[PDB]
Design a protein around this ligand. Structure first.
Ligand SMILES: C[S@@+](CC[C@H](N)C(=O)[O-])C[C@H]1O[C@@H](n2cnc3c(N)ncnc32)[C@H](O)[C@@H]1O
Ligand SMILES: [Hg+2]
Ligand SMILES: [Hg+2]
Length: 180
């Protein structure tokens, strides 16, 4: 196809939630191979920019500062913050998901650790009034994580893009209006 399933899931979210606007600065976590950043550049235009990260390498994209490393490493955080600088960040987006073993009592804790890391970076860099979109799986830990996001944002929706496989346990929490 011309674009990946991931690209289509974000297009569906932009259609439903209107997160991306011209000139915004966006953080893209678990960016490889680049669908979400490629999509966001079409919305933020050439004057916006993205600071992206993945364990895997990916093709460069004009307007995207891409750092390849393990987001679980405190060091990689430091380097990502170096690319953000004093730019205000209007959206933090995360599509990170772990290598899955196939056993939920193992895969869910691995996945929840990454979205907890994504929320901690959101707390640290997202500007007041900003948005956070994160891939999360149904199951253990989902209720508490959603409650925490609801306490930090003015509006929160749980989206299941039509492009998301019906068999997949994933959903996307879409939060807008980061509270003061
Ligand atoms: C569903 S894919 C991302 C697809 C991407 N949104 C796109 O549009 O191409 C999930 C990504 O999370 C990344 N990931 C998982 N654990 C990570 C970690 N510790 N640090 C950085 N990226 C991680 C993976 O390497 C994988 O590329
Ligand atoms: Hg990275
Ligand atoms: Hg936040």
């Amino acid at each position: 196809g011309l674009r990946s399933r991931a690209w289509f899931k974000l297009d569906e979210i932009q259609q439903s939630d209107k997160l991306f606007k011209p000139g915004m600065t966006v953080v893209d976590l678990g960016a490889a191979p680049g669908g979400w950043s490629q999509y966001v550049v079409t919305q933020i235009g050439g004057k916006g920019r993205i600071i992206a990260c993945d364990l895997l390498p990916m093709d460069p994209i004009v307007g995207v500062d891409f750092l390849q490393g393990d987001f679980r490493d405190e060091l990689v955080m430091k380097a990502l913050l170096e690319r953000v600088g004093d730019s205000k960040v209007q959206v933090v987006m995360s599509d990170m998901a772990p290598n899955m073993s196939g056993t939920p009592a193992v895969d869910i804790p691995r996945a929840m650790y990454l979205v907890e890391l994504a929320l901690e970076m959101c707390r640290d860099v997202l500007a007041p009034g900003g948005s956070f979109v994160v891939k999360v799986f149904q199951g253990e830990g989902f209720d508490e994580y959603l409650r925490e996001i609801r306490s930090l944002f003015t509006k929160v929706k749980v989206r299941k893009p039509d492009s998301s496989r019906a068999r997949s346990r994933e959903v996307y929490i879409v939060a807008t209006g980061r509270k003061p």
